[PDB]
Design a protein around this ligand. Sequence first.
Ligand SMILES: Cc1nc(N)nc2c1cc(-c1cn[nH]c1)c(=O)n2C1CCCC1
Length: 842
Amino acid sequence: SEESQAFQRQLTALIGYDVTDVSNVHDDELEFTRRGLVTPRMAEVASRDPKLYAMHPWVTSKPLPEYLWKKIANNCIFIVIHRSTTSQTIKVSPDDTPGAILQSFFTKMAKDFVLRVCGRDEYLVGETPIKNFQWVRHCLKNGEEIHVVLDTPPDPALDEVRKEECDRKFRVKIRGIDIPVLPRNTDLTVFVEANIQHGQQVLCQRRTSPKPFTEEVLWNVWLEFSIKIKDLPKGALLNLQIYCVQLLYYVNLLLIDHRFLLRRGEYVLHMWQISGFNADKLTSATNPDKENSMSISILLDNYCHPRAEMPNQLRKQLEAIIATDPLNPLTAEDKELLWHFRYESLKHPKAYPKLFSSVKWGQQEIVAKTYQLLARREVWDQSALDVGLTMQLLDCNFSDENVRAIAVQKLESLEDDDVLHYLLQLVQAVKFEPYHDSALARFLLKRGLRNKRIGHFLFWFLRSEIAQSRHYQQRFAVILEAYLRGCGTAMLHDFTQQVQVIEMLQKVTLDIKSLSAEKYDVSSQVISQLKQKLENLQNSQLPESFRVPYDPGLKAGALAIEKCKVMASKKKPLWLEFKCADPTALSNETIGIIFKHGDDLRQDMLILQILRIMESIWETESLDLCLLPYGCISTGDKIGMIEIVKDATTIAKIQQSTVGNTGAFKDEVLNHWLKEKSPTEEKFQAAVERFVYSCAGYCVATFVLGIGDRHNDNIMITETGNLFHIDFGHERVPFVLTPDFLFVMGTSGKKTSPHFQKFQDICVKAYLALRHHTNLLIILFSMMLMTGMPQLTSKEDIEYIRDALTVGKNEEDAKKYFLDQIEVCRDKGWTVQFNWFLHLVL
Ligand SMILES: Cc1nc(N)nc2c1cc(-c1cn[nH]c1)c(=O)n2C1CCCC1
């Protein structure tokens, strides 16, 4: 067909990769996954409610924080319904369903339709109380009034989907290695290390005789392994690595294919290089660059087609191992204890990661026994979903189909609200899967196709990696295509517009970087070029309206060249302001987006996502630490978009303003900046209240994630007291609590005050609230470093969180430690702040 071909070119433009390309492949796994993904796609597409899908209500089943009821001692929530110019308020109960609200409006004024939010593409529909809608909850947290325009429901016909159409020991021959260009260092020797890895664990290791590092190094060696072919587990990788000792290149080949067949034949594998552990080292993908990359020649001539009662102190020994942290290492003694008493271990869902890692995957008998254990699941299936525990089974330590599936089975219970909270880390967890088609990938696909909101972010998260990861672009592309093949023409159209706008704006940011590279000033010659480039695009290129990638509810239209500016950073970022495409928008505020090139925004995406997970933990204990986890999406190679937080200034800009500059910092400026920016002394005290909470929040979050020690330049504050850290792109103070912050808190030097007692109290509640979910945080942290950052210590770097979360210690010793930390920041004052300035000169 020709319309099947024209649509495939549309999918390729959306993906940023061609899924039909067979040039960097040595098997049909990517094709076989494309076919494989049709069934779960169509099933979900066939199962969806067209009314609800088109309207995507963003709802929750979580209670409603104490701290949010205090906004209603009246049991009355006010909603203002709009038509053309007419607007009328309605007295609503928190449990009032939107259905009851429509026949309370039509009743009141008597002498089919849907409630859409003013300015946004969000709707208040379905069988849920208005207290249970995320937008209403935002209006309550922000003191805002619920403006809702009464209009016709969107046509579910717009969301239409276009119809688709042997006991022999294992051995590998290392023929040789070839690189077209060698010139670098001296002439150090080179050998090939062949590892049978499964769940990051090395089952068997075999090296070659060291030979001279030339442009072609032939060995013609058969590497005999101890492992038998029947004993090889599905999901095992032949990990081929090159050492000079030091590691230069790696490549992995899956010993067993997607059709359970044993890999047999001749392979010329183009290898990835290391810079002079992480998710990239696990990839089955080969380096697409055949011209510059190192390759390995290999040959596979391997054929095939494959009660009692626990003692008191042993039960206690087992329970002590099960109680331990995820980062706690297991002894051969602990493993034998977990395994021998596996049926007792099975009774504890929290023992699962330790138990499933305790398995000897290199033994066909043991794996069958493990498969026998998972059949008696019962205690697992009945356990309350523990995402922390579930995510733990989806990391690098688990390379088994069955173990990984039981964890995915647990994620199904999640409401759309919680899926959004973990989506990024769940997509990032696909990197850990041995195979392209997996339960996790099908889970993500299913969930994305069922909710537009999840589907939007799924697109962008998949796109973020397909554009920057040579290691996983193929796999993510195959899943993106699957998603795009069932999301609907409505969404395919919005995505088309978003991609076009972002591609255009990316060009401008790069072109503007050329004009003044690292010299900081921003000449009117550059300001004119940006202004011309913007008006030149607006005229006949940029579409009339695009969906905001970091906030799909907001639709952005026309630019505002007058507010658009290039900025003073060494990397020249674009500050772009837009008119809200929506005519029913209650305000006149623009949509602000910071298009920037320079840093890897993928790390920032991950940091912001944990920040939202900490906010939700805090909600479970009725704490609101007023964080601002701003919109941030990585669009391509070291390029992306940041959300512009309205009425905000940098902490350094405020100190700078009253002159002094050269390391000079006055403790009073922040307080005067707040008083000056607040029209009434109520607005001022509310801002000090906002500062106390936001400050405590960033202090805890920051310290826990190890991104505490920051420059003034990188901490911002709103005109309304709300503090927030920015740019998490890559003496020591645990966090930023400087004398200027402490002065807003009242306190002057080594003293005490009512607002500081409050601040100290909120830190302890917040820190303890985090510690209640130690394992959750430990796993996300670990995952974030493996899938987002460069090279990382499979202990050191990761163990930071454990030490920072003060694992093992009681609630009193933990509170002391955090209050000690606060004092370190007090003692040093401006020491570190001035120290950054000093480093510019010395
Ligand atoms: C969220 C936000 N709001 C405002 N309103 N200005 C910001 C930011 C964030 C960042 C940011 C950069 N990298 N990562 C984040 C930022 O630089 N800014 C400003 C633009 C120039 C300096 C201050």
